[PDB]
Design a protein around this ligand. Sequence first.
Ligand SMILES: CC(=O)C1=C(O)C=C2Oc3c(C(C)=O)c(O)c(C)c(O)c3[C@@]2(C)C1=O
Ligand SMILES: CC(=O)C1=C(O)C=C2Oc3c(C(C)=O)c(O)c(C)c(O)c3[C@@]2(C)C1=O
Ligand SMILES: [Co+2]
Ligand SMILES: [Co+2]
Lengths: 364, 364
Amino acid sequence: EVNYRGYHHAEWWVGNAKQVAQFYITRMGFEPVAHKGLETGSRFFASHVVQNNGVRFVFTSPVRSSARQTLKAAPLADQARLDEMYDHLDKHGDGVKDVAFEVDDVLAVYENAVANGAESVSSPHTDSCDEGDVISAAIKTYGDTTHTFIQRTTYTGPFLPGYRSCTTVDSANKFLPPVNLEAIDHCVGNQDWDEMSDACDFYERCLGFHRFWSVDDKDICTEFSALKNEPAHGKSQIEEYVDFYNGPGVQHIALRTPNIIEAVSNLRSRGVEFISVPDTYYENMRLRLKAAGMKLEESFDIIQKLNILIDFDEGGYLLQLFTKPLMDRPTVFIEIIQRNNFDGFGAGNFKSLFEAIEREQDLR
Amino acid sequence: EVNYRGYHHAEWWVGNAKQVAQFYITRMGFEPVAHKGLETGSRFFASHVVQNNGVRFVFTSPVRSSARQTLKAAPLADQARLDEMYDHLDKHGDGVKDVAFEVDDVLAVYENAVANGAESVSSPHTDSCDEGDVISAAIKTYGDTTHTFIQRTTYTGPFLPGYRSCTTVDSANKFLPPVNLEAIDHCVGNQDWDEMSDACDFYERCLGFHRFWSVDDKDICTEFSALKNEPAHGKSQIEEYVDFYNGPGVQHIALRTPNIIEAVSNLRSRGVEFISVPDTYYENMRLRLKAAGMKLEESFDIIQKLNILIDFDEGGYLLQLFTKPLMDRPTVFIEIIQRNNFDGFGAGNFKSLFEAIEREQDLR
Ligand SMILES: CC(=O)C1=C(O)C=C2Oc3c(C(C)=O)c(O)c(C)c(O)c3[C@@]2(C)C1=O
Ligand SMILES: CC(=O)C1=C(O)C=C2Oc3c(C(C)=O)c(O)c(C)c(O)c3[C@@]2(C)C1=O
Ligand SMILES: [Co+2]
Ligand SMILES: [Co+2]
């Protein structure tokens, strides 16, 4: 019954994979699924994959230091990998690193990608455990985040080669209200203009008759190309959406739910914390929705209490919400979105939210 | 009613303070208490303090990278601090960094410490917010972990200068069975022999007529000085206590509970995971306890199910248990201990547990 929307998973690079992974277990309803580490011969990195219906996260941490003087000298390729991982956690901190797509024909989707100028990160190769085989490749897309192409061949195991399945459920979830998340809706690994642009232009040059590997990126780039804020050291009436819009190296990963009220509630009660949109947003939005005769399913007054956002067109609307920044840097957010016939991505909420500080800064 | 046993707190250095701190909120029953960061002018580090009755943890993360090229050039003292924090997370990873003691007369306890050869880390100084003042100092003790001496003067605020109080309770705890932890029982920031020794000899030279700042370290060094394992690539019948005993740079922090059964249960059900001691341990222990006429309060059979450990003497016993390593390095553990008239620290369980693999390796 589960539904990946073609996303194999998203892999994070984080300092404490083992413990950070549990954040999503306790706060957001995930379940431990697979593991890769010193128990399956991974001498240099541990990986913890937690899943929520279609949503699958991988958290990956080095298990050892750079010049680890006690046991082995690291092979040259591997010390470079460890070195790379620390330099990313320094520059960026905990965050999404790689979006990986279930793909038929990695060789082909990889080939076209670099023909049109993709920065290669991992030419096609074939990780091969005892449960089978898989072909992957990877390319730089949005900043230093990446896309990975995955073609299952003979592999049958839990997840990928090297991974072992997970030995049973998590107990904290028999006490916690569940979070009905469906699948990964989209992901922008870096929201700098230059960076976004660069990645979008690259995607456009990847368009052909064969369908592009990430429909959700093609529609984001399309919707936001039709147009390309202002802060205050007050807090800002936009609160942390101003950091979302104007912060550097900001990311967000969005997670589709069939019920954003149910989702947001059970996350409010598990202890997750979202940005507060001002009252003036709903003021103006209630008129816009009414004048346009767009009648929502959900009570407008509950969408207000929950600081949930709205965008729409003639055929339907979306419901959107953002967590407070997940870490001590204001750079990583998670979006929860519910669609009722709207392929949109929230372009309207830039105008609306920017207009929200507008009436407040114009107030003086 | 709360009881710190003279421990102001333990401060961890971790990669993701904001999220790691919540681990202890969800998995172990802590509550958010104070915060220090970009919201109180801390341009370089964030601190999250969570408390459980007497137990108070501080988690501290850099909010910025080393050569953060976007905003400020860091002052020389501060870039050194950021640089230091990354080098510790590289060499060691997430773990306890500093044990801090509520102390009258920092100047004096600091003075004697370095007279007898303490490695100074922070001469007496006086952090001074608008709610008052505090004197601190710090010295290297066990490896690169530290002790900090804290003398409240005019400070009245939540916690320390720069900290703001915490805006209300965590919701996940109205759904989770509580964990009745009392206070910090002890802490060994590095269990290498050389390192332990060095720190103990240093403590001994700190003994005088004035009482020593950490009674729990003086008794550890005393009990374990009366004596100073063997592993298998099988897993080991000792399971992860072999990593505890023979692993390098292992730490553990112990947390006293009045009811280790209640504590361990509610932690089993919140999702915390402990090492399994073999059956042969309880086999031999039931005879030892009986021959010695030591009658326990708690059902021996529940202490067996819960992989809880036992040490005792003529006047009473202790009950001990260890988590599985908390991170992808096998280097940080947490001990839960319950005392019934026994100042011991588990020296007996070395003999018992070492003897447990003994009958198993002797089995062949
Ligand atoms: C509202 C939100 O969820 C965000 C999203 O999910 C998809 C994003 O793509 C862009 C792009 C470029 C064109 O792709 C852009 O230029 C701006 C100014 C922008 O604001 C966004 C985004 C970040 C959007 O704001
Ligand atoms: C059982 C446990 O809780 C541990 C504890 O809490 C206090 C520790 O101090 C030592 C010391 C030195 C003398 O202090 C030592 O040499 C050995 C071999 C030792 O094993 C321990 C410890 C680590 C003990 O094992
Ligand atoms: Co969005
Ligand atoms: Co102990």
